[PDB]
Amino acid sequence: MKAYQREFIEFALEKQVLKFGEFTLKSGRKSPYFFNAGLFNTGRDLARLGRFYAAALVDSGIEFDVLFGPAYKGIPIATTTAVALADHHDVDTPYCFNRKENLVGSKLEGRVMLVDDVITAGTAIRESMELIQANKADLAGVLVAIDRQEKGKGELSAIQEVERDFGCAVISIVSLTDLITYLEQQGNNTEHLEAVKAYRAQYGI
């Protein structure tokens, strides 16, 4: 995986946004991990998050003319991503978000990149799509923080349903698979820990 994906995971772990262990999901299943981007709730958590969404966006190479964040959760995420693009990528993108009710910022025109936290059932995307549709712009992509890569009600994932229903690509910072790589790519900790302690014991303090 690339550097930003590794640094995202570590950051999510540091902030307790990502956690491993036993977890009962409010949506049936028992899961081995918990992920809740809502815990990125301070100014430095947001700065970093804008920068990780921005990195993921530039990595995809998808061209977009406006970054749209749906009310309400998409608003801060679009905001910090837009900021990360101006200051760290020298990309000055128009940005837009809606009021529930009607548009703040730029016009919804051309290729629209929707940014949000997660794709649960595709709800926020459906209302937004009706705004894009209405404005005769098209949905070029949706960017979320994590792609869980698991079957839903049927056989397609929640992301795959969004792709089918709206015709856009879904972009994620990271995926279940990255979480496995990350875990599989760890330097046998207790092995090195003991050797480091042993080396210390003989040369320490």
Which segments are annotated as binding site? 26, 34-35, 72-73, 99-100, 116-124, 148
104 binds a second copy (CB under 8 A): yes
Does position 76 interact with a second copy (CB under 8 A)? The reply is: yes
| Nearest distance from C-beta of residue 194 to a second copy, angstroms | 35
43 binds a second copy (CB under 8 A): yes
Site string for Cl ion, 51-90 (x = CB under 5 A): ---------------------xx-----------------
Which strand (E) or helix (H) includes residue 143? Answer: strand 138-147
In this structure, how many other beta carbons lie within 10 angstroms of the beta carbon of residue 71?
A: 16
Least separation, in Å, of the C-beta of 122 and a second copy? 17
Tell me 73's DSSP state: T
Q: Any bridge partners for residue 174, and if so which? A: 146
Nearest Cα neighbor of 60 from 176, 148, 186, 169 is 169
Interaction partner, residue 100 (a second copy, Cl ion, none; CB < 5-8 Å by kind): a second copy
162-165: long-range contacts at Cβ-Cβ below 8 A with a sequence spacing of 24 or more? Answer: 162/119, 162/122, 162/125, 165/122, 165/126
> Judged by CB under 8 A, which stretch of 1-9, 93-101, 137-145, 165-173 contacts a second copy?
93-101
Give least dist CB 162 to a second copy, A.
22
Residue 40 or 166: the one with the smaller Cβ distance to a second copy is: 40
Cα gap 9→105, rounded to integer Å:
31
- CA angle, 175 then 178 then 182, to 5°: 145
Distance of CA 146 to the CA centre of its chain: 5
d(CA 25, CA 2): 29
Q: How many chain residues bind a second copy (CB under 8 A)?
A: 38
Applying CB under 5 A, the residues found at the interface with Cl ion are 72-73
Applying CB under 8 A, the residues found at the interface with a second copy are 38, 40-47, 50, 67, 71-73, 75-76, 79-87, 91-97, 99-101, 104-106
